Design a protein around this ligand. Structure first.
Ligand SMILES: CCc1cccc(CCN(CC2CCNCC2)S(=O)(=O)CCCCn2nc(C)c3c(C)n(-c4ccc(C)cc4)nc3c2=O)c1
Length: 143
């Protein structure tokens, strides 16, 4: 289909270059990744320090690249706990310039670590407006 071929167009030329998870009161970096975790069809792993759980909020800064233009680049993220959706996050970047490289900052604002580690999956849905480009998943260990 036209929408299904466009969604593959954007996906082929997309890249998550790096991602930072900082403490939002100190800017202190708690976890850095350079893998492309937007890559679907794979269960990625993320071993973040458990101190992230004590933080009031967390600043998530990522840098991505897109060959294809995107009118309204947004994210639908679901936090699964033991296979059921615990929370639903929504973030919107907006217009993406074709062949552009963009850094995007967002702010994520409980249960003990021993319970969450290995039992938290983050499903991130990649949208351009109403078109879904891809779906990736990351498993979280709180070391
Ligand atoms: C509701 C109860 C509960 C239960 C379990 C867990 C939580 C929240 C956990 N915590 C946030 C809290 C911590 C304590 N109070 C402050 C906020 S957390 O541990 O800090 C998470 C920090 C990491 C979140 N995260 N991680 C990755 C790896 C991501 C990737 C790859 N993409 C990604 C984005 C775009 C694309 C195209 C592709 C991919 N988006 C990611 C992302 O959002 C809550």
């Amino acid at each position: 289909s036209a929408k299904d071929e466009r969604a593959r167009e954007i996906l082929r030329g997309f890249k998550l270059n790096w991602m930072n998870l900082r403490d939002a009161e100190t800017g202190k970096i708690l976890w850095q990744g350079t893998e492309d975790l937007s890559v679907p069809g794979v269960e990625h792993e993320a071993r973040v320090p458990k101190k992230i759980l004590k933080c009031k909020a967390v600043s998530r800064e990522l840098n991505f690249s897109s060959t294809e233009q995107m009118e309204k680049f947004r994210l639908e993220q679901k936090v699964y706990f033991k296979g059921q959706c615990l929370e639903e996050w929504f973030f919107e970047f907006g217009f993406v310039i074709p062949n552009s490289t963009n850094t995007w900052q967002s702010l994520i604002e409980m249960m003990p670590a021993s319970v969450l580690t290995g039992n938290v999956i983050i499903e991130t849905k990649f949208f351009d407006d109403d078109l879904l480009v891809s779906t990736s998943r990351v498993r979280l260990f709180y070391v």
